[PDB]
Amino acid sequence: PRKMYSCAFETTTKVEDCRVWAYGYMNIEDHSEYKIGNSLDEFMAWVLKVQADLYFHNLKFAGAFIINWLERNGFKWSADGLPNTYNTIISRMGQWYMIDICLGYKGKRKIHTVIYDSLKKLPFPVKKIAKDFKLTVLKGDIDYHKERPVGYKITPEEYAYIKNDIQIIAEALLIQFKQGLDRMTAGSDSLKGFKDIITTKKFKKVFPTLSLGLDKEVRYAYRGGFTWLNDRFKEKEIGEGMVFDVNSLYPAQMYSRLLPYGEPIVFEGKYVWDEDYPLHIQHIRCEFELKEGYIPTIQIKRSRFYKGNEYLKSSGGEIADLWLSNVDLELMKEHYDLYNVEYISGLKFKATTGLFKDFIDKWTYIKTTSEGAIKQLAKLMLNSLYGKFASNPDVTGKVPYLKENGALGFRLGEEETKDPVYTPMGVFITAWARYTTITAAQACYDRIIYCDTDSIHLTGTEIPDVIKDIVDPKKLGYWAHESTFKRAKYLRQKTYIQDIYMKEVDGKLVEGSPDDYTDIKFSVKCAGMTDKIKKEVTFENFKVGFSRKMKPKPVQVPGGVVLVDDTFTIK
Numbered sequence: 001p002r003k004m005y006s007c008a009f010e011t012t013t014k015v016e017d018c019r020v021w022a023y024g025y026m027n028i029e030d031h032s033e034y035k036i037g038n039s040l041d042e043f044m045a046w047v048l049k050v051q052a053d054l055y056f057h058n059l060k061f062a063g064a065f066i067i068n069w070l071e072r073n074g075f076k077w078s079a080d081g082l083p084n085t086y087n088t089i090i091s092r093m094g095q096w097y098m099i100d101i102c103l104g105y106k107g108k109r110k111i112h113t114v115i116y117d118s119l120k121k122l123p124f125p126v127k128k129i130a131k132d133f134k135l136t137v138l139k140g141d142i143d144y145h146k147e148r149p150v151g152y153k154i155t156p157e158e159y160a161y162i163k164n165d166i167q168i169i170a171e172a173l174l175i176q177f178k179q180g181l182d183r184m185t186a187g188s189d190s191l192k193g194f195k196d197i198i199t200t201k202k203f204k205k206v207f208p209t210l211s212l213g214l215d216k217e218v219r220y221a222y223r224g225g226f227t228w229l230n231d232r233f234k235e236k237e238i239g240e241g242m243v244f245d246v247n248s249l250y251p252a253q254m255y256s257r258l259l260p261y262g263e264p265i266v267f268e269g270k271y272v273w274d275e276d277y278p279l280h281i282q283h284i285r286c287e288f289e290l291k292e293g294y295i296p297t298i299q300i301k302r303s304r305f306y307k308g309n310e311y312l313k314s315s316g317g318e319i320a321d322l323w324l325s326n327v328d329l330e331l332m333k334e335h336y337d338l339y340n341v342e343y344i345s346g347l348k349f350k351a352t353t354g355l356f357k358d359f360i361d362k363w364t365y366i367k368t369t370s371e372g373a374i375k376q377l378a379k380l381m382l383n384s385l386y387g388k389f390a391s392n393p394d395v396t397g398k399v400p401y402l403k404e405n406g407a408l409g410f411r412l413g414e415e416e417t418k419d420p421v422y423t424p425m426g427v428f429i430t431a432w433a434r435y436t437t438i439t440a441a442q443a444c445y446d447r448i449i450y451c452d453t454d455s456i457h458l459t460g461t462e463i464p465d466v467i468k469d470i471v472d473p474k475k476l477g478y479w480a481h482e483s484t485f486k487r488a489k490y491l492r493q494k495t496y497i498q499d500i501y502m503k504e505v506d507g508k509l510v511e512g513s514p515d516d517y518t519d520i521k522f523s524v525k526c527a528g529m530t531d532k533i534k535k536e537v538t539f540e541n542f543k544v545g546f547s548r549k550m551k552p553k554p555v556q557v558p559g560g561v562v563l564v565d566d567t568f569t570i571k
């Protein structure tokens with residue numbers, strides 16, 4: 001029986017003197033078992049003996065100090081097994097999921113200790129988790145920048161903050177495990193709950209594993225959320241607008257849209273209506289010109305290093321090569337002018353509208369009938385399922401090693417690939433999601449300012465007539481009027497500012513209307529802008545070029561990781 005602990009470290013902030021000055025572990029199941037010390041050597045000695053599963057919140061940080069220690073004490077990275085070595089799962093983008101430490105076997109059973117990231121099961125900060133789950137949290141925090149030399153004695157106050165931090169996580173994981181959510185990720189917890197509802201027998205039949213090439217072709221037709229800013233209102237500031245958000249976007253498409261399942265049938269040329277294979281992805285070749293008065297639809301995203309959804313308005317001379325779901329293709333034909341269209345071939349799929357209703361009915365009920373902890377978990381169950389279908393291909397990741405200067409280094413690991421769940425599903429759930437947002441914005445073309453996956457920003461404060469019949473404060477899939485603003489400024493995608501009418505507070509602040517309001521709250525939304533930097537944004541300050549050296553960023557140094565301030569700039 002594998003024990004489970006909730007751990008944490010407290011470290012120094014000096015680049016030249018980076019080290020762990022306090023640690024702590026608590027038994028997720030028995031919160032009476034726990035220890036707080038000031039020696040990493042002492043913690044690691046325990047780690048090697050415990051033969052259990054440990055969780056750190058945001059392993060990307062703690063894991064650096066851990067690997068640093070292992071590498072200095074006879075441990076080397078090893079792709080799989082081999083006594084006195086450790087394996088890892090760090091993604092190409094630097095996301096840490098696991099540190100497996102092996103010490104050999106004994107009587108044909110291996111002796112080890114695996115470390116995981118609790119941030120993958122509960123994707124929020126500790127404080128937030130404390131508030132939302134109704135967990136006792138100590139007011140304030142350690143003086144993160146107080147001198148702590150070798151030999152430092154943890155004071156009784158600091159001692160309670162460490163115990164509290166690890167206890168908050170310990171209570172959350174426990175509640176989560178007592179609810180049957182016993183996975184490494186929240187995403188996998190959803191898939192388990194889903195598979196538990198339709199059987200691993202029906203699952204396997206409904207979501208077969210496609211060939212490597214067949215999966216790659218499907219992936220060609222996958223896109224993310226629709227995030228677009230009207231060039232017209234670009235950078236210039238405006239006044240008086242409204243914002244509409246879809247009530248649970250993804251669970252809504254999954255609830256009643258025609259979704260794919262089963263083995264695809266390959267066809268040549270243009271798709272012909274097939275009652276049994278209602279859905280399809282078509283490989284087409286053409287040239288196009290966005291029509292006058294229509295929003296761009298054909299996108300290109302996630303490029304080489306940095307993204308920022310780019311929407312083409314024309315092929316401009318060159319014949320384009322595209323793979324589109326029938327949902328995306330239908331929108332393309334309306335918004336653009338297509339030239340010399342050549343249908344090459346595609347994929348047909350069986351489809352149904354009832355694969356997710358039971359799973360969604362079950363957890364939406366629990367969500368509506370619960371509070372705090374159980375309620376946040378219900379939301380996680382409902383929100384993390386979509387992600388499992390629109391998952392990635394190769395598991396190629398970063399492999400650590402210790403450099404001569406004492407700090408960690410990383411190199412690309414050998415190629416490595418896993419198995420898709422069912423790519424066709426992720427393609428169509430996002431397509432319908434985009435179709436929902438796009439058609440609504442296009443219907444309000446005259447007043448449209450901005451779009452971001454599940455929301456639309458319009459000028460004016462009056463609900464458009466064409467949207468009236470699909471607006472609702474709580475109904476699944478309906479557009480909920482989320483706020484009205486007196487003025488705003490949009491610099492770029494996901495980069496805007498608004499003055500929101502905030503209804504008088506009868507004890508607590510809410511969104512108000514231009515008639516019934518009390519406060520005018522200023523809110524900022526920006527790419528990598530911290531709450532510290534946001535508290536310096538002003539309407540004539542907010543513009544491309546804005547910068548400030550207050551954005552902390554991790555840096556591998558001997559010892560482990562340290563946070564340094566790096567210039568954040570709105571470009």
Ligand SMILES: [Mg+2]
Pocket residue numbers: 141142161162165
């Ligand atoms: Mg603390």
